[PDB]
């Protein structure tokens, strides 16, 4: 007799993965979090004095 | 280990209620305090 994993495993794996990636990508990029990456190769230095 | 089947089975719906109530009991009071930090 098929168990919970046989019936729902594929959907739990696919949905869980999709949901996890989507919400972490949104959190990481869309809500103003400051990661403060390296300026190297990214920032143009500007006169400060 | 072997065990008997559940004497009082917890259905998926019942588990969703228990998990929901558990999470809210942690999240609502802390959330109320942190939301109100400015006022404090």
């Amino acid at each position: 007799a098929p168990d919970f994993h046989d019936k729902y495993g594929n959907a739990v794996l696919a949905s869980g993965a999709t949901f996890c990636v989507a919400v972490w990508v949104y959190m990481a990029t869309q809500i103003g979090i400051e990661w403060n990456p390296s300026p190297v190769g990214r920032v143009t230095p500007k006169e400060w004095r | 280990i072997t065990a008997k089947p559940a004497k009082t089975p917890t259905s998926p719906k019942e588990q969703a209620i228990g998990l929901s109530v558990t999470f809210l009991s942690f999240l609502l009071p802390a959330g109320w305090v942190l939301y109100h930090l400015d006022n404090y």
């Binding site: 403060n36 990456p37 390296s38 300026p39 400060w48 004095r49 | -």
Partner: protein, 227 residues
């Protein structure tokens, strides 16, 4: 100072810090290798259906398990202790400077010749000049001659503090009633930053250290101008 996304030590400013980088590289290789070997052996023990569950004789294998680690510790201890004794070696300083920790700022005393002393406080975030570093700049930097052996003496007039400059390999506790000694020698001019490294109350996070390393002649004129 540290830079964003930094993984390792600040670049060495002093020969002893250079020595600590090479010693850390050697130790880290060993840590990587042992961690890796344990994870690999776990994965090896767990990936066969072959079994052997009868009693296993331990004594031969326990020789390997104790000797090889004993040898590895000796290979760490030897360079570890060479560096320990190298920092302790007699060097003849040209200059003595004192620092006193306070809640929540450093005072400096240069009293070889004249009575020069001043307080060194964090620049508030709202008073930073463009390009200056949050929580790291001070009003009055510790100006010192580059390429010279300096004796730093460290104490406190209240609670514990600790006077640290990572890029020079320095950390000396500031204890009331005690005068702790360390030596400082910068291979380079520049600005070298540190932060109070003993929990000392409300503004422990906000009493940093800034060394300004310049030629002797500049240090002399600065000293004279600070009396």
């Amino acid at each position: 100072m540290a830079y964003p996304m930094q993984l390792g030590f600040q670049d060495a400013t002093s020969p002893i810090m250079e020595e600590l980088l090479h010693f850390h590289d050697h130790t880290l290789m060993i840590v990587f290798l042992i961690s890796s070997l344990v994870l690999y052996i776990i994965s090896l023990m767990l990936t066969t259906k072959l079994t052997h569950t009868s009693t296993m004789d331990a004594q031969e294998v326990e020789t390997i398990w104790t000797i090889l680690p004993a040898i590895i510790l000796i290979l760490i201890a030897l360079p570890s202790l060479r560096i320990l004794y190298m920092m302790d070696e007699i060097n003849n300083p040209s200059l003595t400077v004192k620092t006193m920790g306070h809640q929540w700022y450093w005072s400096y005393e240069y009293t070889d010749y004249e009575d020069l002393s001043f307080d060194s406080y964090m620049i508030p975030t709202s008073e930073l000049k463009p390009g200056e570093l949050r929580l790291l700049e001070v009003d009055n930097r510790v100006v010192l001659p580059m390429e010279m052996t300096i004796r730093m003496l460290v104490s406190s007039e209240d609670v514990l503090h600790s006077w640290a400059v990572p890029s020079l390999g320095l950390k000396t506790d500031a204890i009331p009633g005690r005068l702790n000694q360390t030596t400082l020698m910068s291979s380079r001019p520049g600005l070298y930053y540190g932060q109070c490294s003993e929990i000392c109350g409300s503004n422990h996070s906000f009493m940093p250290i800034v060394l300004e390393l310049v030629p002797l002649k500049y240090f002399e004129k600065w000293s004279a101008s600070m009396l």
